Amino acid sequence: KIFKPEELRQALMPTLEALYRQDPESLPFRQPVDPQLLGIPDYFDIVKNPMDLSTIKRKLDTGQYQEPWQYVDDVWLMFNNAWLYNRKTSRVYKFCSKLAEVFEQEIDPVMQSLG
Ligand SMILES: CCOc1ccc(C(C)=O)cc1Nc1ccc2ccn(S(C)(=O)=O)c2c1
Numbered sequence: 019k020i021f022k023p024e025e026l027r028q029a030l031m032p033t034l035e036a037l038y039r040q041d042p043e044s045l046p047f048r049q050p051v052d053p054q055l056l057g058i059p060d061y062f063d064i065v066k067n068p069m070d071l072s073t074i075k076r077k078l079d080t081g082q083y084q085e086p087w088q089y090v091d092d093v094w095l096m097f098n099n100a101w102l103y104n105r106k107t108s109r110v111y112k113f114c115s116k117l118a119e120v121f122e123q124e125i126d127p128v129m130q131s132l133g
Pocket residue numbers: 045046047051056058099100103104109110
C-alpha cells in the first residue's frame with residue numbers, strides 16, 4: 019500500500035524506543051561508531067554502510083522510509099554490522115544479540131498491525 023510518514027512514525031518509533039530502553043545493551047548503538055574516538059581505526063575498512071539508532075530515528079522523523087521493510091532493513095543493517103565487525107566474546111556482539119531478540123519481539127505485532 020501507501021504508508022504515510024506519520025503512520026510509519028507512530029507504528030515504528032515505539033519499536034526503536036524499545037531498543038533505546040535496553041541498558042546496558044543499546045549504549046554502543048545510540049550514536050554512529052566513531053572509529054578514531056573508540057580506537058578502532060579499521061572499522062570503516064570492514065563496515066561499508068554504517069548504521070545506528072540515532073540515524074534510524076532521524077530517518078523516521080524525516081520521512082525517509084516509504085515501506086516498513088526499509089526500516090527493518092536498517093535495523094538489521096545495524097545488527098549485521100556489529101556481528102561482522104566485533105568478536106563473538108565482545109560486549110558489542112553480545113549486546114547486539116540481545117537487541118536483535120528485543121527487536122524481533124516488538125516488530126512482529128507491529129507488522130501485523132501495518133498489514
Ligand atoms: C569496544 C569499542 O567500542 C565499540 C566497538 C564497536 C561498536 C560497534 C557498534 O560496532 C561500538 C563500540 N562502542 C562502545 C562499546 C561499548 C560500550 C559500552 C558503553 N559504551 S558508551 C561509551 O556508553 O557508548 C560503549 C560503546
